[PDB]
Design a protein around this ligand. Sequence first.
Ligand SMILES: Cc1ccccc1NC(=O)[C@@H](Cc1ccccc1)NC(=O)c1ccc[se]1
Ligand SMILES: [Mg+2]
Ligand SMILES: [Zn+2]
Lengths: 48, 224, 225, 81, 23, 711, 620, 62
Amino acid sequence: RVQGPREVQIHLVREVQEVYRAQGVSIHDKHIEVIVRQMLRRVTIIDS
Amino acid sequence: ISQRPTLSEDVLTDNRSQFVIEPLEPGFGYTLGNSLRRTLLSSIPGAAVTSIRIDGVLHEFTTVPGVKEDVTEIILNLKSLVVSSEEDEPVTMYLRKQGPGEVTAGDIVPPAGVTVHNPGMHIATLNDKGKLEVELVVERGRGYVPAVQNRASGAEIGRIPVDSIYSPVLKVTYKVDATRVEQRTDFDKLILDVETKNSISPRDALASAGKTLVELFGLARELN
Amino acid sequence: RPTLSEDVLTDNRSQFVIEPLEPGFGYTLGNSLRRTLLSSIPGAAVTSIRIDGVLHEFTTVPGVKEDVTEIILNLKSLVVSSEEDEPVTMYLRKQGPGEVTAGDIVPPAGVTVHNPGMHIATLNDKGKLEVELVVERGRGYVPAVQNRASEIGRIPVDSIYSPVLKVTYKVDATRVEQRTDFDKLILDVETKNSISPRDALASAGKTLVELFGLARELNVEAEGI
Amino acid sequence: GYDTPLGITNPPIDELLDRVSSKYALVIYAAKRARQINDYYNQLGEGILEYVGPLVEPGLQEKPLSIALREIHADLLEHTE
Amino acid sequence: SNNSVPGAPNRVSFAKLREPLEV
Amino acid sequence: NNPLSGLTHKRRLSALGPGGLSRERAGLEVRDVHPSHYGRMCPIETPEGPNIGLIGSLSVYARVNPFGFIETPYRKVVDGVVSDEIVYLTADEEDRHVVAQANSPIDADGRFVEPRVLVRRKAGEVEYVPSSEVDYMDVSPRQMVSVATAMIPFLEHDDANRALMGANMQRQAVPLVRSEAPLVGTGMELRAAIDAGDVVVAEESGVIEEVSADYITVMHDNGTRRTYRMRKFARSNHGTCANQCPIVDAGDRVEAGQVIADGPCTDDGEMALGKNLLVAIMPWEGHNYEDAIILSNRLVEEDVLTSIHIEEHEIDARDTKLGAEEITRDIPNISDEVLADLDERGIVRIGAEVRDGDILVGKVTPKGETELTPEERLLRAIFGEKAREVRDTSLKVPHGESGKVIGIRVFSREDEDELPAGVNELVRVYVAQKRKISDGDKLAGRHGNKGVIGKILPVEDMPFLADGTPVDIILNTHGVPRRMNIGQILETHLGWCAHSGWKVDAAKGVPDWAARLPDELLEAQPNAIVSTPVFDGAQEAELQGLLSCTLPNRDGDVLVDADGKAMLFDGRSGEPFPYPVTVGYMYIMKLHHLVDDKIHARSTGPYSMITQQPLGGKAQFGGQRFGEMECWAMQAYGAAYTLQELLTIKSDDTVGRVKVYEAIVKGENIPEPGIPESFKVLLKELQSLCLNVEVLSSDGAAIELREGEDE
Amino acid sequence: QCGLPKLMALELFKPFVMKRLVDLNHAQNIKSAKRMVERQRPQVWDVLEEVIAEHPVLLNRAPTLHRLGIQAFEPMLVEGKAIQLHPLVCEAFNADFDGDQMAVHLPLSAEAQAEARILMLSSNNILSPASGRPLAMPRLDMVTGLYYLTTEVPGDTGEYQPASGDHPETGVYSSPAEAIMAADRGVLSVRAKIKVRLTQLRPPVEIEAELFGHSGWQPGDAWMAETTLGRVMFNELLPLGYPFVNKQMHKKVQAAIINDLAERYPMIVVAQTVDKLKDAGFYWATRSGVTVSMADVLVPPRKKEILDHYEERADKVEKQFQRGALNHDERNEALVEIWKEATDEVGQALREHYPDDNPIITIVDSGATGNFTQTRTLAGMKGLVTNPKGEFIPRPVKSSFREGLTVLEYFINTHGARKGLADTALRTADSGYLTRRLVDVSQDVIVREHDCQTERGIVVELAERAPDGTLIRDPYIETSAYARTLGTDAVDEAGNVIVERGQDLGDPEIDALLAAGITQVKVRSVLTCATSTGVCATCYGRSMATGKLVDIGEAVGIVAAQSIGEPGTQLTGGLPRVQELFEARVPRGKAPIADVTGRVRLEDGERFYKITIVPDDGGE
Amino acid sequence: WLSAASFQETTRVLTDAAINCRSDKLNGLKENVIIGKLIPAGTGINRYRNIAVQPTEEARAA
DNA sequence: CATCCGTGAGTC
Ligand SMILES: Cc1ccccc1NC(=O)[C@@H](Cc1ccccc1)NC(=O)c1ccc[se]1
Ligand SMILES: [Mg+2]
Ligand SMILES: [Zn+2]
């Protein structure tokens, strides 16, 4: 609501990364984004 | 910068003899002695038991009334039986003994051209009322040959195949006296060590070891 | 079934294929036949050299492009066959602009230089070059410290007597009858410009036949081929 | 410049991928040709008008796939999507 | 000796003397 | 599987069962080690699987009180004076007291050396506490452990993880042709073998009156005779060979409680779960890579790691509606070559050899009188052979099974032998196998250091010691510091000292390192047995010391040094290995994970009744499962046809599997997969839930699925 | 290749062999051909030898976590009943040899085999689809064997010696064939530094331009080097055409070379090359002398010395709490620190007291395997054990495993080891569950088009500016930039463009940007590139496997879910945070965010924090 | 609804879809595997599936 | 923000 759909995608990508970074695990951001994309492919109906 | 035809000396002991061979090329001794070691322990022709049969026994896994041991342990004892045979073809031995008293490799009846080199070998502990009528087959072969092979020939159900350890060799090693003095006096001295099974001689073993190798190294001399 | 002998070739070297060996005899023949090829064939190589305008090694020879070091290396690679066991001596002299090779070498009687086109030292103008060579016979490889007395500019050289350069062997398993236990020995052998690989194997072969003779003489009992 | 490709590595997959859009495309390309080859042999016995036979020398007991894969490498086949 | 109780072959033991109660 | 396996089974403590807890209901608290478990329940013995923490063994010195709790013995201390008076304590009773550690130094009379001593306390707390406040002390250092745990030499050098597997695997050991006692022991080996009940103990004292492989007789002091009968080649519950053999010779004076004849995995009344092997700690030509194991061919030739295995195959004859199954020697369309190993009844003759596919019990049942094929009717008039009405239903040898038939046990309803209703003749054929060890067999040390048999080189290949002795096993160095189980190293050091024998130097006095070494050990024979109790036994000092004490060979030459290493010769190249190789003796068990069993495959075979998919398990000749996760790997790849093939013609396409088979044997092309019967099942399952499911074509019409709708 | 057992194969190709049996008239029909196979007649072993000709098989090892858990091989018959595997694909299946079983599946249809030999063949899938790193690479004994001969040993025999006095230059050889006959005599060590003239290896890129001027080096051109005999044998595998390497082969270095080869040199080169490395390392891990003895594993000299220092620094805290000056939560939180520090000082003690000859350290310090923390626990001390709650226990384990832990020490370590495996048993289930969820949500996600064409992408912070000067490389680069394709021309300060749009970023293309001074590049992405069903090929960019532009039709959606869930076993936030993010839960922490930008008004209270914000642009 | 049911909460999936009369265009990964259709990816797509392979005209029987 | 009912939970 504050920063908009694209930004909230960039937050997820890195915050998810920030967890795998800790245990020395390296996944390319590419794979993360694929899942993140499918999370946002829908919108709610305010007015019918 | 020197040339001398190599020799072949010997330092003896009844069951084991040291073969000193010198002079030899530098760093040549280690891979030269091993060439013989691998030959002896593997492909020296000997003789041992192939299969057996027992009176009242149909298979390997049972007991004979009165005998302290079972058939398996008896077969297991006969693995250490040291035999030498001249008959290239299979031959039949015999062992019988009744009542109390210990039976050994001496109660065996070796036919012509067959000798038992260790009579004092414990086979079984026959107790009172114990009777044991055995029958053993010895052939000539080399190396190691599994028991399981005899079964599928069409061998009658009475016969029980046994593993054949033909190789009459026991333990072989070597050491090397490589003179590395900075001169044309640098050479290698080989001392091979061979111990037999009192089936054949430590020398006679190395002689059939040399008969094989030469017949193999000769195909590198024939022209194309 | 008795064993075969095969060959896949090249000018200076070749691949020998030996099969079928009894299970466990690929390695029995392996490291033994190699050490024979690299140590048991006689030839001739350089023991020591002498340069005219050299009192110490660091300075390069007056009129020569190469350093004192790099010329030694080219000289080690010179293939020569002496006919007499006793150490012979050949001279090589050339002056002026150009390049000195192995065809300029002045050889003694019964001594042959097998690669006359080998590069040695690039001379410039006003470039004088006179070198004495000491050629011996022997086998295998000999360090330089052992040739430090063979004293107005004598240099001990690494003697590479052996006429076989480098040999490698691998042992795979062939499948005779039902048994996939039998061994197969592939051998790679590179020789100098002196003797053919096909020849150097027969010599090494015959050589080892002698060794295993001392044993076989004792009884000649049993073996089957 | 490499060592002689042995076994199922021949023909070298890299040179094979050059005559095709992608990996997946090479598959159906090869296999459908392999289907034609095995068709040809079985049909030939009792059926005329069979698919075009092996465009290269069929090695002793060479799999229909293996025959096909070689002639792809030899650019002897045509590529349609 | 370790368990010198039933009639067992002597198996010598690196130990502090354990005599509280047998197993 | 072995005596120990059974013994530990009886002392198992499970939280599972009716009245207990389910597996899914167990949190992380129920499973992990609680302080009260000390001396009661072992913290080391527990399975690796999803059962972990819910199954455990009971500690050695522990017992049960009449109220259902677990007591453990403690020595009593009056006032800084350790007594021999012993009392068993429950858990919460120990909580209201203070217990001293077992190894706390004690005066010859019985007083503590230090005022402050290591003290165990309520809630798992530990502190130093004045000797006057010491109430009780532990019975033994090895108190907290189970039976299986104790038999692990130098336990205090191996992490609880590999120590855990080391305990579990010991139950998984297999009885060999003949059993060798471990050179390095812990003392527990004795009592275990006896209490196992799978060895034979003397009730009352006496003397061996007559001995046979069959039975042992003992004449008693009072004049009565008792005869113990040997178990010979009895099949176990797990297919191992429970076989007992006499120890004592005839006329041996034996006393009450003595092992007169041990059984499986037992030598001289001691736990013999394996063999003492000639170890070498070095990476060797990659054949030991990733915990893989290399073997000397000596172990095959000498049956060193060979075992015996019995299988029980069973079949019966019933009463059908077409008659009754009869067991006979006459089986339809079978030559007299396949029937060769049978007797007159139809049963295999004792001692005969059986391969897989062969016949064991010739049985035939009357087949349903259905009209035989008009394409087989025609085939029977030409050759003029009349078809029998008895279909073959004989008991054939299952795949992989082989060996010799060692027994036939027949039960006939005719011979009044009481059968369940409807059975006539019931046959049991027992086949024994003599399995020499091979590639893919699972060998394991007592330190949780498992591994499968990578390669078995011929004896000559082996990296051998200077005197020409080929090693037995080549472990991999890499997988040793990773596992935190260097007790296996110490077993090798002490092991080698046990094989050679040793002698400390007493000239200029008994040395300082061997000052803590009991007198009996300052001199040791070649092939001598020792004990290293848990939390006691050999220390690293004494060990390094004894390594220098190593006695030379028959050739008067020492073989290993004080480091523990020695020099080896590469059996292939002949050249001596450049660096010193650690060599010695380690105890090795042959586990019960054998390739003979585990290997399995399938072309076609049986199929499910409902799903029409292939069955499962090696027992039913079922195929493997290509599950959800395995499918993802396919989908990720992009091999649509491969995946499709696996879940159609390879699986439950009724008409598909049959047709693909013919297409292969005809050498034609593999056709196009159809509709999976699994799906048809689903749609008929959904319709039974008032779910009008219809498959629509591109038009919009509901199509048939090899079936029609009618009212 | 893979060693498929004879007894296994005969059943898999059963209707295939019965075909070739009635073919060659060993049986008259298919019915007798059946009996021939069932009876295992000696003929069929010769027929089966023909039937399985280049007919690929599938090896799978459950659990299948990523697509390399199923790979294709060329079936090789072998006596015995054990399936034989290649040492390199061990990294793939996560397959060790402690009794592991693998599944075998045989493709039938003409398409199936094609998909096997092409898509799923082991020698093609060398890089991980997750990171593009080499999986089929030297791993244990392999790396250790190579690390051996590539190590430069100072005073080793046969070392190069400068001329001085009456003796010339020692340690200079004409050819590699000469240095070989030196070590075989025994004069030269394979690890001693020497000078050699080579004729069949391309010199470094830094040296070639000096001795040729990039005239194009040629198989025959000689050049002098200053390495070891061992490091020379190594480069004969790379082989020609690839620049020489004069370093000791740590795993990271061996990791780099393969990675580089995977880029430039074709697949069938890397496959056969990494084959040569396997063979090499194994021969030399044998003559490396890596061996564990009680001798090699040594207890530190300052053992009781250092411990008595911290046992003393602890009793000062025990008595400082004895007077109640310290809180209970403080007392242990400090005692943790004291012993945490103590363990480290023991770790240092080993590294310096331990020679690099030491096989235990040799294995560790070569990246072959194992941590030094294991080595410390082994030779120094265990240290701290975990409380059931998770906190660090106040009392330590001063004893090493080599010294033998005391009774009470064993008990509490055992408690930890049990909880370790239990949580090791639970996380896997959470990982696998999360794995299947990720898989499902991304199924209608495939590569459908070649290009979406929208210029939309996202900012990538390639570099960080340095206050001191120059520039600082970013840590997130490789995971967030290297596989991307530009959607915007990256221009420097000048009007000069460095990398085009529609261009895949490679290693030099980064350096081209890194040295250009541009610290931000816009790149195409799945999130931004908009297509109807699924995504395009361009934005997704380079498939981590092929090292090229992803093909059209690759099921990247399921590939992605695998790449995330597979390594999910190695966590401690940890795995919950991962799930918490992928399921969009209102987080535990719930740290607030500024609704509107502006000036921060900190007006803290001890009872509660309140943060007011004044909107920069007017606002409320 | 095919993809839905074979994931989680299967009994809920069916009830809703049954009321909504939801049709299922069998076009998805999970969707295709169940019915036994070639999956809509890899070599399964029409772009590669329907391919014609013919000998070159330059190639001709000997 | 906290309860109550129903539904998930690695593979062979
Ligand atoms: C604290 C604790 C938690 C779980 C399980 C056991 C323990 N306690 C111990 O392990 C004690 C020994 C003990 C067991 C039971 C009852 C009281 C005490 N030992 C230790 O914490 C330590 C002993 C030596 C170094 Se840390
Ligand atoms: Mg495993
Ligand atoms: Zn796009």
